[PDB]
């Protein structure tokens, strides 16, 4: 939500209420610079 319109005040009221960020949002992983759960990253690859 801070990545749109009211940026700073959102961070303020989020810091006041001590909110928990799931980090499964797109723009959140964009900010963190991680591979977002989008299409290709909507799963995990392992070895059997």
């Amino acid at each position: 939500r801070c990545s749109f319109e009211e940026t700073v005040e959102i961070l303020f009221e989020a810091g006041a209420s001590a909110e928990l960020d799931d980090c499964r949002g797109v723009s959140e992983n964009v900010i963190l610079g991680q591979m977002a759960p989008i299409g290709t990253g909507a799963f995990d690859v392992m070895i059997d």
Binding site: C2, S3, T7, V8, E9, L11, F12, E13, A14, G15, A16, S17, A18, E19, L20, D21, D22, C23, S27, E28, V30, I31, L32, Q34
Partner: protein, 351 residues
Amino acid sequence: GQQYSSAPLRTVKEVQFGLFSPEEVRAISVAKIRFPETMDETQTRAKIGGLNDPRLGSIDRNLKCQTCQEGMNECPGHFGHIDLAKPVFHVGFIAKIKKVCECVCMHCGKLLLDEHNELMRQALAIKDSKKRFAAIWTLCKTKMVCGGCGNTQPTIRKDGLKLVGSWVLSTEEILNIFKHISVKDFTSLGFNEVFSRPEWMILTCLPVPPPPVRPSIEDDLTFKLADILKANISLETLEHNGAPHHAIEEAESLLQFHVATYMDNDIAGQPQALQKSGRPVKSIRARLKGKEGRIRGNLMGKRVDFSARTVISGDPNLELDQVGVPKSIAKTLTYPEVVTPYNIDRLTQLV
């Protein structure tokens, strides 16, 4: 890239926002800020033990940085701290604070209505913090009289950067009030246990951002920190020495002013705190506000390498999924290819 670390590489899964407790602020800090003087001290290219300490981060392309070394390319920012002569208001919380003082009477520190009330049972039933606080604030700000401590709760209104009372509230007073709200009352209005408390909204001591936040080519944030420090030392000077009544209050409101405008400069208050060049100065709030802000301008979209741009033209002899790329651009942009037995010859030719 950078270098090898013994620590395991992990991924940020959760982000727990919260407030900065002055205790944790001064515990985290690695340098106290006593001198407003930036770097040069009596014709000396160094750093005085005040602002911009070499402990916060060296700035001369050296090989040392607060004993941790690692130059200035690897080492991030090491936060400092500055203690204010008197507690001041955090601007971005001015509203919220003013709301809390209306949900809890003065001196005591208790909610006006409990489970004894009919509507308060319904208001406290909501699990959502914001909705609960919004539901309680509307059903608690009408209460004038009052657990005991029966006192006529004053009508509080906003004025500049202070608060008044009708039967002028001090910041130290409101600090003392929020310090006594305890834990059980925090859950009833959104706040958290160890992360965010109303006794941390007001600024006792404020953290000092390292040079990688306010570089020098001096930065506006450095000037504003110099203003805060100046107001602080001036206040302390007018406190420890001859202390008039109608003279130190102006200094308190001055420190309050500089601190409040250090973060947010676009306020309802017309004084926008200009600089020496006549510039309105760049506050931390302005650094983040889009579209040229940090979030929307450097995170949601940022300039990238391995890219090109040119005038386009049509070509009837190109396939649909093809793109004509000028030779110069082809020589400029590059692709990293690992040497394998399949392509070692071709790569050898390319090299």
